[PDB]
Amino acid sequence: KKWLGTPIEEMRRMPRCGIRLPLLRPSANHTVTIRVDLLRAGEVPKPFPTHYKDLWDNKHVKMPCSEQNLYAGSRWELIQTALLNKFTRPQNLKDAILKYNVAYSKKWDFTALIDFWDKVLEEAEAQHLYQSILPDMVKIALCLPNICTQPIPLLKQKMNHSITMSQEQIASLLANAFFCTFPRRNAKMKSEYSSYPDINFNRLFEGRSSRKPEKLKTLFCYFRRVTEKKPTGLVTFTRQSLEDFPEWERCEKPLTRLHVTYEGTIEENGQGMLQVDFANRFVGGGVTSAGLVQEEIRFLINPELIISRLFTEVLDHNECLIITGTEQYSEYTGYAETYRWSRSHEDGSERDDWQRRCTEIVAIDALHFRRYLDQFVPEKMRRELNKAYCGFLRPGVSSENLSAVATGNWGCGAFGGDARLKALIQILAAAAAERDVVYFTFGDSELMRDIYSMHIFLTERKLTVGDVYKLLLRYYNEECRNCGPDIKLYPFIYHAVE
Ligand SMILES: Cn1c2c(c(=S)n(C)c1=O)N[C@H](SCCN1CCOCC1)N2
């Protein structure tokens, strides 16, 4: 069989499982950058306030259009002068970006941009790029002060805060990131923003990886779509930091339901479910540089995710980022060296009452294990349980209104995670958050069978979260602490219980 466990049709999903949203409203913990009183299906949202207001300080994004962005001269004026020239050759665009980035004229390589334009694209495609797409991108970038009129707070460490903005606002901000206009975000030895991801796209232009043309095709598909026809919806970005975590050894909650399959994907088959992003602590990972596995791919086919890098501080152990409403603009095949842009995607997701696409993604970063056995240390197991639990828990929401979790081999691959341990950690964390699990093994049919078999074994014997966590602790003591191990985890568990 291609899938085991509970039928996926029986799992909860949005919008059907959600409660009616309250009235969207700004508050101390919710920044809203549009006119809620004018929000209407199929209309471009109106920015609030009407006229640009600037904050240039330690708690907000430093906007390129700020009067305090100086070089004294006005850097915004220089950006306007640089970008409003006709581009007919890729050197023109390199020279323009470097006019307001003089300090990086040696450090920043543009080989991938030059090669995309001159050596990948056919003549007609290149003409469309520089006669239509790039000029349209410049115009939406330079509209920033009329589009993003309200200061954007940083989602700093330990903040429990949300930002809701329009897709159109995000497009203006991402156009600025493409043209590398965000100040104070470039220096290798920067301090103010050293704990924040890169936002400017300059590393997307460097080098000769065969992957860069596919990244650029994916992003220009998005740019071509959102400059041609303004998107009308909203997107919410929520930083969540929990202080009260389970006493896992004492948790008497039962396990929840499981659907596990080695076919399908989170983004296609997990529609309306809580979709896990296998994140870097710096959200988005290498999306704007080198990096093209699960997180980067999702950030490329849903580019509105990328703007989280503008304002999201590196995630601490007890934190996650929840993004609701991003739209899928691209389809793809493969991953890493085999990733290819396929075609434009027409997102058919419903929108909720805040005009957000019914797509919820949570970025949770797994640990990186130098040594395989390190991940069975109890402190490290607890850390991953608590990270997933934070990602899955929705304070204030009842379990019947919680979609299933759509996830997979989180932190396995480059990070060195063991898939069978990580599957059980997510199953336990979901159980504690009272959500069902939809698990994609991405071609690994044996893993599907193994996860299913363990899950049904444990549920039929009515073992609790705490019962299972204590078995993980026994495995650490017996096979790992004084030890790769002589016996694998699931065999150990079956033997210990039987
Ligand atoms: C869309 N998608 C997806 C993956 C997974 S696992 N899942 C569940 C998914 O839905 N992997 C790939 S990218 C790197 C490949 N690695 C192989 C499996 O270990 C994790 C990552 N893309």
Author numbering: 451 to 521, 532 to 943, 947 to 961
Paper excerpt:
PARG, a single gene alternatively spliced to generate five isoforms, is an endo- and exo-glycohydrolase that rapidly degrades PAR generated by PARP1 to coordinate DNA repair. PARG hydrolyzes α(1′′-2′) O-glycosidic linkages in PAR chains to release ADP-ribose and oligo(ADP-ribose) chains that may signal genotoxic stress. The hPARG active site has two deep pockets that specifically engage the adenine and diphosphate group of ADPR.
JA2131 and JA2120 bind to the adenine-binding pocket of hPARG in the same orientation as JA2-4. As for JA2-4, the 6´-thiocarbonyl of JA2131 makes a direct van der Waals contact with the main chain amide of Asn869 (3.6 Å) from the conserved macrodomain fold. Notably, the 6´-thiocarbonyl group of JA2-4 series inhibitors displaces this water molecule to form improved interactions with the adenine-binding pocket of hPARG. From the protein-ligand interactions identified here, the 6´-thio-methylxanthine derivatives JA2-4 and JA2131 compete with the adenine moiety of PAR substrates for active site binding. The results show JA2131 treatment induced a 9 °C stabilization of PARG proteins in cells; whereas, the PCNA control showed no significant change in thermal stability in response to JA2131 treatment. These results, together with the observed extensive physical interactions between JA2131 and its binding site on hPARG, support the conclusion that JA2131 selectively inhibits PARG activity.
